[PDB]
Amino acid sequence: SHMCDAFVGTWKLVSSENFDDYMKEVGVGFATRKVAGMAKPNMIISVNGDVITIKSESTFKNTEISFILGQEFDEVTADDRKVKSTITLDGGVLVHVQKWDGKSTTIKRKREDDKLVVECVMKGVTSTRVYERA
Ligand SMILES: C[C@@](CCOc1ccc(Cl)c(F)c1)(C(=O)O)c1ccc(Cl)c(Cl)c1
Structure with missing residues (x-):
């Protein structure tokens, strides 16, 4: 309880x-x-209890995932990859690993000041996305 309060x-x-x-x-x-x-x-x-839900709405795609920390799930990404995902909490950071076709990418979500910072990494390449409260 209260695990991800600062993300909600x-x-x-x-x-x-x-x-x-x-x-x-x-x-x-x-x-x-x-x-x-x-x-x-x-x-x-x-x-809600142990279940975290992340929904993303945009003009491109609307997606939704619900999961329990540490418990793998199947996800279809917005770009239509069929991946196996596992999300864990590591030192206050939500760490989301996606596996498909012998490949892997990691998405980290962290609170920094009033922002939610999203770092997406694939091999040597990082993207940083910053969100503020709506
Ligand atoms: C980057 C991310 C989350 C991951 O999402 C990914 C990742 C790869 C690909 Cl290829 C893709 F399309 C989406 C975000 O938290 O900002 C996001 C969300 C929602 C949308 Cl709509 C977009 Cl574009 C991007």
Whole structure:
């Protein structure tokens, strides 16, 4: 109880850096990169007992995942990858690992001041996305 309190709420994207290069590293094709890169998603995070839900709404795609920390689940990503995901809490940071096709990417979500900072890493390439409260 109270594990992710500081994440819960409704958040809006305010900045993005290096996302196109991250998507390239992931394997995302041209047209999806262009439309996905334009998106300005809202992220809605909620907790009910042990179940965390992260919803993302944008003009590109609406997605929703619900999960228990440490417990793998199957996810279809906005770019239509079919991945095996595991999300854990490590020192206050939500760490989301996605596995598919012998590949892996990690998404870390952290509270920093009034922001929620999202770092997406694929091999040597990092993208940083900053969300503020809606
Ligand atoms: C980056 C992220 C979360 C992960 O999401 C990914 C990741 C890869 C790919 Cl290829 C993709 F399309 C989405 C965010 O927290 O900002 C996001 C959310 C929602 C949207 Cl709509 C977009 Cl574009 C990006």
